[PDB]
Amino acid sequence: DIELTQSPASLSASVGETVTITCRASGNIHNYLAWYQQKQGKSPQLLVYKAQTLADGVPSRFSGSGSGTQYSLKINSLQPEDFGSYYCQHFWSTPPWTFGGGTKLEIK
Amino acid sequence: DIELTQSPASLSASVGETVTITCRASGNIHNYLAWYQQKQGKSPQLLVYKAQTLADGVPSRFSGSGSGTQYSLKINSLQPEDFGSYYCQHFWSTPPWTFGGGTKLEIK
Amino acid sequence: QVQLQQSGPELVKPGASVKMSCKASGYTFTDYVIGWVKQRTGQGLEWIGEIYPGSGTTYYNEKFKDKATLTADKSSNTAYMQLSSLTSEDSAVYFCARGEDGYYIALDYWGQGTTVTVSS
Amino acid sequence: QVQLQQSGPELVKPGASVKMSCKASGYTFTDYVIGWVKQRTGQGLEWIGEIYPGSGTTYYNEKFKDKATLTADKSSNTAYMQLSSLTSEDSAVYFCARGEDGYYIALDYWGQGTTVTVSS
Amino acid sequence: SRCTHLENRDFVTGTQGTTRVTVLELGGCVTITAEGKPSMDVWLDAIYQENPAKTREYCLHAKLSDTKVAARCPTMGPATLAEEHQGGTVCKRDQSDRGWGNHCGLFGKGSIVACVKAACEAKKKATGHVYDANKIVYTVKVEPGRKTASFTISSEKTILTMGEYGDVLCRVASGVDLAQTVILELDKTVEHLPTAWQVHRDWFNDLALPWKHEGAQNWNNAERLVEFGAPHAVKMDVYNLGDQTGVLLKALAGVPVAHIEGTKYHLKSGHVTCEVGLEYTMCDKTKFTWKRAPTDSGHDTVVMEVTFSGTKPCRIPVRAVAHGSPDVNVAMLITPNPTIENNGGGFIEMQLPPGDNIIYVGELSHQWFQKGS
Amino acid sequence: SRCTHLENRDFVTGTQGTTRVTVLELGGCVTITAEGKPSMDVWLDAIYQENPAKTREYCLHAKLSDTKVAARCPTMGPATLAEEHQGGTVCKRDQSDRGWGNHCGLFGKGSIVACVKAACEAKKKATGHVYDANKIVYTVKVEPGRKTASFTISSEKTILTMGEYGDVLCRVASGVDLAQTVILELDKTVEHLPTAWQVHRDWFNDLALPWKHEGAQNWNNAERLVEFGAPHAVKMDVYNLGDQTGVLLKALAGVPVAHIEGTKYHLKSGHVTCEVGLEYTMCDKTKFTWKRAPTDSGHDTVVMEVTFSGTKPCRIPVRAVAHGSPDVNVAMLITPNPTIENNGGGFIEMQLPPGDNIIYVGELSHQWFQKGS
């Protein structure tokens, strides 16, 4: 099976700044890893797919990156709507399509 | 074994006459048969041996004869001393040297 | 616009069963995978399983292989998840989500969620 | 002249034994056979047996093989007959008689007789 | 596919207008495909007869008893024993040296005879069987959910429903020649030994042992395990020639075996001629994983199994490139049109050019170094 | 006379000054006479050893048990069993065909080994014995009241008192050559069989059986009764080659036998060279009778026995005349100076001229027709 470890667990930052969160895959997932943003009590939104491609409607300030087993997501100029929970997931080779534990991003 | 049958069993005749007694052998005794005369309460005397030979002291009037299995003794001119019991016996090949039953010769 | 419309919330007793729906609006139903995801209150996301409604092909997480059963009705464009013999451990928000059949590399549209409460 | 002298008469009880003698006078003892003959009262002659005193060779009638035993003493010129375990059937006159050793074809001299009476 | 489990395999394909195909060998496998049809594997599974005919029983160890000897002096006639005219006995008549020293009146040859009763030891029997042409079963099997069809002379045609794949004539007269074969079955014991042998008829009939037919009480030629000793005055011994098991098994060295399934006697060789009436989209590249990594098949090809986790059924995008040019597929596929089905699919056999290549199944990859000829 | 009980007889006579005579063969008879001496019969009676030395034990029927099989996949090392380094076992190492179909990751040869414990069946043993030169008994017997003298290397001279006939050296070194002889003793059972055979040493040592020395636990070359089957995946059968009794006894056809008297092992052939230290009137013609009437001896002579009822001892007046002239004795007496003794005598052997003759013993007579040459 694949395990996805997200780091940090949580972080607090303010509007206009930049943060970077990471996702470590236990095995090689050939860049088939997507990122999803979830707000409190709401449904997950797709931000990034295939490690670094933004989904339709997603702001340029979201940078998908990484490769092999170490992936990352960087957000420039944080806006209020960026605060929430961030989840990574992977669709490579064989299920389960596991998720990470998520990183919790909040204001200051 | 050899059986010697004497015949007659007994006979009565008078002085001056002639009598003939016989001895029949059950098997061939090659002329080895002797004749003995016995008086009342006395010891047997040899008269004839080898079927027809007179023993020493025996009167010419005693005729030993026969052969093979049929033998005989003939007495001419009977005298008083001729009366008694007559026995035949045989010494051929193998014992017992059986006797006959005897012929009893008496006066008239 | 693509819309996944889920059914309303269920309040059931232990040992009971629930069947929830997911209705596909605004896209060719059979060309996309329907995937189901669990989320307990304040917890992470957990993949349950998924169905390829164009062929009826299913995949299930080993954790839920005896809990959930996935079906799909092509004519109404609706997918269904049925959860059997419920416990408190099944109290959670359940999501249906869309994936590209043939290049299944993300869940690009999510339904609003069906909340299941198991209770005394 | 040849003379065979026998012993005197015996009066004995049943089961007893007698031994009688025969003494040779007037001839070379060892050159002639001594033969023994039985005679019951008023009955025929029966050959018992005989001994060749020059060699001690004996012959016995089967009838008397366990009754009579024959011996002979060269030095005294005497032959002996011994009769064992007597019964009434043994009451009789017993004769010893002479025969030519080498041409044994007759008993040419007889003893006077030993009378044995077995009695109550 | 059953034909991927062995190298003994043939391949048959029906074109447009071919609704029938025509020689199965015992233990083989034929893959049969046809336009618009599913793939089926067909093979001759067994050739046998239940409770086959028996010819001779042979005895391996004589059970001799009741030895008797009779003898006569040189002119006292011939010697005789009751057993000379009895069944189940072995007797020998001879002449011994008779004279004063052994209680005969004359010096010369005296008639003597020795007899013995000859039985056979338990589990020391060898039975020969032959096949009845009207009772031989030819069982053939077909799989996509396997189905079985057995055949005999009075029933040479069977139609099978292959689960859900539709419906699908074996001439028993076109099978095995069993004119000169006898199946040899010994009793059981000696720790362990083959249950049966296939021997030539001639060899079997020439076996120098006591013999009989099933149900008989007296053994024929029982003297083959009996040795009479020399005659000595009023005696003449009867000897046992011993247990012939070892002798026989040495004679059976190099001989083919058979098999006994309870009551069913199976051949280890054969065939049957038959007649058979015969009446997608691309797989998601990101969903393949190796089940069995590409390895040398042992017969100069490369084999692999993959597990696919996308929509089923679909066609597998398998190719390989040689180090040097990544544009050109160098895979000579032996597994034609590799496809993932709902219940099966995923096995691929291919042949690659000498050198360092990369095998691709969707995006799944694995390097493969091919040795030169 | 013992020498009148058989034709195998020699005749030795000592003249004036001969007080000793010099090669007895086992089972013969020598009549020895000498001036002023009684007649004695001398012969070699037996040659044997009590509890002779043993060489090899051979096994006729393997007792196989605890069959084990171990196997490995093509690159999983060599297969192994504990029994490969244990005594009393037979093992074979081979290679089988391994692949995906029989649970190996690779296709290729896989190591396989099969072991079995090899014991020997009760009463299926063959023991070979040899003779110890210092323990061989040569027993010779003498009769006029028979007496016996046994000899060995440390005791080659025995003086016997022959009842009442006075007193009478055998070199054990001048006897049987036992350099290449082994006495073969099988266990006992098979109804009946010879107790022992005399086989050549070479033949015995070349016997293809399991073997050991007395008191040993494990059999050497036990694989001689074991046949390993072909390797099949993870299996390989162990077969028994069967009971070799019949095989052996057929090999023993034409072979001389021996004899076992409890503990004493006897030869059926031999001899011994020895050295022996030697320190009337006419019968009554009317007392002979026939005990055994003149008859053909079987070796071109005429024999008879008579019983004599006159004085013993004496010389028998035996003669014969041919029809034609009753004056001339035509009897060629073979029995020299025929005499009646106190305990024995009366047997006469003679040879007569072709034609109708009359035999006379005293006056006892019997006609005899002699056949021509």
Side-chain angles (χ1 to χ4, degrees), chain A, chain B, chain C, chain D, chain E residues 1-14 17 19-20 22-23 25-130 132-135 137-157 159-187 189-190 192-271 273-275 277-373, chain F residues 1-14 17 19-20 22-23 25-130 132-135 137-157 159-187 189-190 192-271 273-275 277-373:
Chain A
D1 285 356
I2 293 298
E3 182 177 358
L4 299 177
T5 298
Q6 289 189 227
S7 179
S10 65
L11 76 167
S12 171
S14 63
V15 172
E17 303 306 324
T18 296
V19 295
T20 296
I21 61 170
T22 73
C23 181
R24 181 170 63 86
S26 69
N28 191 330
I29 67 180
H30 302 214
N31 298 231
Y32 290 103
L33 167 159
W35 287 96
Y36 314 87
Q37 178 180 349
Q38 186 181 30
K39 294 179 182 168
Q40 181 67 53
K42 304 291 188 177
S43 298
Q45 304 292 295
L46 178 66
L47 296 181
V48 184
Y49 63 95
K50 222 197 185 247
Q52 62 183 53
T53 299
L54 295 188
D56 293 344
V58 179
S60 67
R61 67 181 184 266
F62 288 85
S63 176
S65 188
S67 71
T69 61
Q70 186 70 62
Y71 296 82
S72 68
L73 178 65
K74 174 183 166 188
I75 306 172
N76 289 299
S77 297
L78 283 170
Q79 301 298 298
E81 69 267 18
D82 294 341
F83 294 104
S85 295
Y86 284 80
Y87 291 93
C88 64
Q89 171 178 51
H90 93 55
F91 307 109
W92 169 253
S93 182
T94 183
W97 309 129
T98 59
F99 293 84
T103 298
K104 187 175 175 182
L105 175 67
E106 61 180 43
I107 62 167
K108 184 174 183 172
Chain B
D1 285 356
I2 293 298
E3 182 177 358
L4 299 177
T5 298
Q6 289 189 227
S7 179
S10 65
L11 76 167
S12 171
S14 63
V15 172
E17 303 306 324
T18 296
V19 295
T20 296
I21 61 170
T22 73
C23 181
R24 181 170 63 86
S26 69
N28 191 330
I29 67 180
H30 302 214
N31 298 231
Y32 290 103
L33 167 159
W35 287 96
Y36 314 87
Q37 178 180 349
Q38 186 181 30
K39 294 179 182 168
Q40 181 67 53
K42 304 291 188 177
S43 298
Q45 304 292 295
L46 178 66
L47 296 181
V48 184
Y49 63 95
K50 222 197 185 247
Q52 62 183 53
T53 299
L54 295 188
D56 293 344
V58 179
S60 67
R61 67 181 184 266
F62 288 85
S63 176
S65 188
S67 71
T69 61
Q70 186 70 62
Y71 296 82
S72 68
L73 178 65
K74 174 183 166 188
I75 306 172
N76 289 299
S77 297
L78 283 170
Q79 301 298 298
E81 69 267 18
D82 294 341
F83 294 104
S85 295
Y86 284 80
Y87 291 93
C88 64
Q89 171 178 51
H90 93 55
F91 307 109
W92 169 253
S93 182
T94 183
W97 309 129
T98 59
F99 293 84
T103 298
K104 187 175 175 182
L105 175 67
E106 61 180 43
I107 62 167
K108 184 174 183 172
Chain C
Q1 183 182 349
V2 173
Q3 178 173 318
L4 300 182
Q5 174 74 67
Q6 296 188 224
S7 62
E10 295 290 1
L11 175 62
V12 295
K13 286 192 170 181
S17 173
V18 295
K19 182 175 178 181
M20 65 184 69
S21 76
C22 180
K23 185 176 183 180
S25 175
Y27 70 91
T28 300
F29 179 65
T30 60
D31 289 335
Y32 297 85
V33 180
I34 304 300
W36 296 83
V37 178
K38 184 173 181 171
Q39 181 169 48
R40 288 186 187 178
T41 304
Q43 301 292 288
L45 296 178
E46 185 167 49
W47 174 81
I48 292 172
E50 66 206 19
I51 189 164
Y52 291 70
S55 66
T57 303
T58 60
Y59 296 90
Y60 300 89
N61 186 338
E62 288 293 301
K63 285 190 66 174
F64 300 86
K65 70 182 179 185
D66 294 316
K67 180 66 56 172
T69 299
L70 300 179
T71 65
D73 181 340
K74 289 182 167 185
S75 71
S76 62
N77 305 344
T78 299
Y80 300 98
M81 182 166 72
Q82 180 160 15
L83 306 178
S84 65
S85 196
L86 296 182
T87 77
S88 67
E89 294 289 293
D90 296 313
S91 297
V93 178
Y94 293 90
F95 292 106
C96 66
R98 194 187 80 159
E100 185 179 3
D101 181 341
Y103 204 27
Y104 184 40
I105 47 182
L107 297 169
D108 63 350
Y109 290 96
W110 291 63
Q112 87 276 23
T114 301
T115 300
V116 178
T117 294
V118 180
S119 176
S120 175
Chain D
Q1 183 182 349
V2 173
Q3 178 173 318
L4 300 182
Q5 174 74 67
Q6 296 188 224
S7 62
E10 295 290 1
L11 175 62
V12 295
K13 286 192 170 181
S17 173
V18 295
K19 182 175 178 181
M20 65 184 69
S21 76
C22 180
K23 185 176 183 180
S25 175
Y27 70 91
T28 300
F29 179 65
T30 60
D31 289 335
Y32 297 85
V33 180
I34 304 300
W36 296 83
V37 178
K38 184 173 181 171
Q39 181 169 48
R40 288 186 187 178
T41 304
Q43 301 292 288
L45 296 178
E46 185 167 49
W47 174 81
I48 292 172
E50 66 206 19
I51 189 164
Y52 291 70
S55 66
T57 303
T58 60
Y59 296 90
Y60 300 89
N61 186 338
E62 288 293 301
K63 285 190 66 174
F64 300 86
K65 70 182 179 185
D66 294 316
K67 180 66 56 172
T69 299
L70 300 179
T71 65
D73 181 340
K74 289 182 167 185
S75 71
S76 62
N77 305 344
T78 299
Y80 300 98
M81 182 166 72
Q82 180 160 15
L83 306 178
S84 65
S85 196
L86 296 182
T87 77
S88 67
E89 294 289 293
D90 296 313
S91 297
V93 178
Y94 293 90
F95 292 106
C96 66
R98 194 187 80 159
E100 185 179 3
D101 181 341
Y103 204 27
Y104 184 40
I105 47 182
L107 297 169
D108 63 350
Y109 290 96
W110 291 63
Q112 87 276 23
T114 301
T115 300
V116 178
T117 294
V118 180
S119 176
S120 175
Chain E
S1 295
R2 181 57 170 162
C3 291
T4 62
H5 300 164
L6 75 175
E7 294 178 0
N8 186 351
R9 64 191 183 184
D10 289 323
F11 300 93
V12 178
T13 297
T19 58
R20 69 177 181 85
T22 302
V23 183
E25 293 186 354
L26 185 62
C29 186
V30 181
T31 297
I32 304 173
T33 61
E35 186 178 2
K37 302 293 190 181
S39 174
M40 298 289 173
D41 285 338
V42 181
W43 64 92
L44 179 62
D45 199 79
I47 303 173
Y48 67 91
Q49 178 176 354
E50 184 177 19
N51 297 325
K54 298 175 189 178
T55 58
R56 290 178 179 168
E57 300 190 24
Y58 288 105
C59 183
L60 298 175
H61 190 194
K63 183 179 180 182
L64 299 176
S65 185
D66 301 16
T67 303
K68 296 179 181 175
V69 178
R72 297 291 183 274
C73 293
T75 58
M76 293 294 284
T80 185
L81 290 168
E83 281 76 359
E84 292 184 271
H85 299 288
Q86 295 185 344
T89 66
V90 180
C91 300
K92 181 186 175 190
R93 297 184 66 83
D94 210 326
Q95 291 179 313
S96 71
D97 288 330
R98 304 306 298 271
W100 290 358
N102 61 39
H103 305 295
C104 291
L106 303 177
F107 291 97
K109 300 293 181 180
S111 173
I112 186 166
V113 59
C115 291
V116 67
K117 293 178 185 168
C120 184
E121 286 290 344
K123 307 298 182 182
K124 298 289 180 176
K125 301 203 290 176
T127 302
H129 300 80
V130 297
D132 183 334
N134 291 316
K135 298 176 182 173
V137 179
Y138 287 76
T139 188
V140 172
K141 280 197 189 195
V142 182
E143 189 174 3
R146 190 178 301 162
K147 299 293 181 183
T148 301
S150 62
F151 303 102
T152 189
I153 291 170
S154 68
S155 185
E156 293 178 299
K157 188 177 181 183
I159 299 170
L160 301 176
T161 298
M162 299 308 300
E164 299 171 358
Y165 293 99
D167 295 330
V168 61
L169 175 62
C170 289
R171 189 163 65 209
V172 169
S174 292
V176 182
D177 181 342
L178 298 170
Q180 301 296 311
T181 300
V182 180
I183 303 302
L184 181 63
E185 176 180 343
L186 315 213
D187 264 88
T189 23
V190 183
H192 174 279
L193 270 183
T195 57
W197 290 257
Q198 296 185 64
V199 297
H200 287 328
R201 184 192 70 88
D202 286 343
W203 180 93
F204 178 83
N205 281 329
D206 292 350
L207 291 178
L209 296 170
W211 62 275
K212 69 181 190 178
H213 299 299
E214 187 177 28
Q217 299 295 305
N218 298 322
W219 292 90
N220 301 327
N221 293 120
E223 75 272 355
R224 289 175 174 171
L225 296 180
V226 178
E227 180 184 11
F228 289 91
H232 298 290
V234 298
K235 294 184 178 180
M236 183 160 76
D237 285 351
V238 179
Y239 299 124
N240 194 310
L241 288 174
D243 187 333
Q244 302 300 304
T245 297
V247 172
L248 178 60
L249 293 174
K250 287 180 175 178
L252 293 171
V255 175
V257 300
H259 184 274
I260 304 171
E261 183 187 355
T263 57
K264 293 167 280 178
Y265 289 63
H266 295 270
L267 295 178
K268 296 291 187 180
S269 177
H271 61 278
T273 302
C274 305
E275 184 69 24
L278 302 178
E279 305 305 334
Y280 308 99
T281 66
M282 196 173 311
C283 297
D284 182 330
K285 37 196 210 131
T286 73
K287 303 295 176 268
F288 288 92
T289 183
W290 293 111
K291 176 176 176 185
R292 294 186 184 271
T295 189
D296 191 327
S297 70
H299 56 268
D300 203 31
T301 70
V302 183
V303 292
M304 62 205 66
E305 292 189 51
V306 295
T307 297
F308 173 70
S309 300
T311 183
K312 297 174 183 175
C314 62
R315 293 166 60 75
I316 298 172
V318 53
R319 73 197 298 266
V321 302
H323 191 287
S325 181
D327 302 306
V328 174
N329 183 7
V330 300
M332 296 173 276
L333 285 175
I334 295 166
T335 302
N337 294 293
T339 295
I340 300 296
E341 291 291 350
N342 284 289
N343 293 289
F347 173 87
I348 299 175
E349 183 175 358
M350 68 181 64
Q351 188 169 9
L352 297 174
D356 189 348
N357 303 313
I358 300 171
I359 298 168
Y360 292 102
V361 180
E363 225 157 307
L364 183 69
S365 67
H366 199 286
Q367 289 179 304
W368 178 260
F369 181 80
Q370 180 64 51
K371 296 182 178 183
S373 177
Chain F
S1 295
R2 181 57 170 162
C3 291
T4 62
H5 300 164
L6 75 175
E7 294 178 0
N8 186 351
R9 64 191 183 184
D10 289 323
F11 300 93
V12 178
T13 297
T19 58
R20 69 177 181 85
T22 302
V23 183
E25 293 186 354
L26 185 62
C29 186
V30 181
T31 297
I32 304 173
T33 61
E35 186 178 2
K37 302 293 190 181
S39 174
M40 298 289 173
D41 285 338
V42 181
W43 64 92
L44 179 62
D45 199 79
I47 303 173
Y48 67 91
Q49 178 176 354
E50 184 177 19
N51 297 325
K54 298 175 189 178
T55 58
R56 290 178 179 168
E57 300 190 24
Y58 288 105
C59 183
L60 298 175
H61 190 194
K63 183 179 180 182
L64 299 176
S65 185
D66 301 16
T67 303
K68 296 179 181 175
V69 178
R72 297 291 183 274
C73 293
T75 58
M76 293 294 284
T80 185
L81 290 168
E83 281 76 359
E84 292 184 271
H85 299 288
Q86 295 185 344
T89 66
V90 180
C91 300
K92 181 186 175 190
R93 297 184 66 83
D94 210 326
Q95 291 179 313
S96 71
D97 288 330
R98 304 306 298 271
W100 290 358
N102 61 39
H103 305 295
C104 291
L106 303 177
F107 291 97
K109 300 293 181 180
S111 173
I112 186 166
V113 59
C115 291
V116 67
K117 293 178 185 168
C120 184
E121 286 290 344
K123 307 298 182 182
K124 298 289 180 176
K125 301 203 290 176
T127 302
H129 300 80
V130 297
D132 183 334
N134 291 316
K135 298 176 182 173
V137 179
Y138 287 76
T139 188
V140 172
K141 280 197 189 195
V142 182
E143 189 174 3
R146 190 178 301 162
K147 299 293 181 183
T148 301
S150 62
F151 303 102
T152 189
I153 291 170
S154 68
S155 185
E156 293 178 299
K157 188 177 181 183
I159 299 170
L160 301 176
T161 298
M162 299 308 300
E164 299 171 358
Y165 293 99
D167 295 330
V168 61
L169 175 62
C170 289
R171 189 163 65 209
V172 169
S174 292
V176 182
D177 181 342
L178 298 170
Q180 301 296 311
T181 300
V182 180
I183 303 302
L184 181 63
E185 176 180 343
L186 315 213
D187 264 88
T189 23
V190 183
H192 174 279
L193 270 183
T195 57
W197 290 257
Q198 296 185 64
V199 297
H200 287 328
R201 184 192 70 88
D202 286 343
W203 180 93
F204 178 83
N205 281 329
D206 292 350
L207 291 178
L209 296 170
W211 62 275
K212 69 181 190 178
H213 299 299
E214 187 177 28
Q217 299 295 305
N218 298 322
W219 292 90
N220 301 327
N221 293 120
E223 75 272 355
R224 289 175 174 171
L225 296 180
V226 178
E227 180 184 11
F228 289 91
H232 298 290
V234 298
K235 294 184 178 180
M236 183 160 76
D237 285 351
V238 179
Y239 299 124
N240 194 310
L241 288 174
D243 187 333
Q244 302 300 304
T245 297
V247 172
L248 178 60
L249 293 174
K250 287 180 175 178
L252 293 171
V255 175
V257 300
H259 184 274
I260 304 171
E261 183 187 355
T263 57
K264 293 167 280 178
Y265 289 63
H266 295 270
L267 295 178
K268 296 291 187 180
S269 177
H271 61 278
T273 302
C274 305
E275 184 69 24
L278 302 178
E279 305 305 334
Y280 308 99
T281 66
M282 196 173 311
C283 297
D284 182 330
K285 37 196 210 131
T286 73
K287 303 295 176 268
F288 288 92
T289 183
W290 293 111
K291 176 176 176 185
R292 294 186 184 271
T295 189
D296 191 327
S297 70
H299 56 268
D300 203 31
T301 70
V302 183
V303 292
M304 62 205 66
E305 292 189 51
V306 295
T307 297
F308 173 70
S309 300
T311 183
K312 297 174 183 175
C314 62
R315 293 166 60 75
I316 298 172
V318 53
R319 73 197 298 266
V321 302
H323 191 287
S325 181
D327 302 306
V328 174
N329 183 7
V330 300
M332 296 173 276
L333 285 175
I334 295 166
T335 302
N337 294 293
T339 295
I340 300 296
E341 291 291 350
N342 284 289
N343 293 289
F347 173 87
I348 299 175
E349 183 175 358
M350 68 181 64
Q351 188 169 9
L352 297 174
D356 189 348
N357 303 313
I358 300 171
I359 298 168
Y360 292 102
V361 180
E363 225 157 307
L364 183 69
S365 67
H366 199 286
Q367 289 179 304
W368 178 260
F369 181 80
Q370 180 64 51
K371 296 182 178 183
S373 177

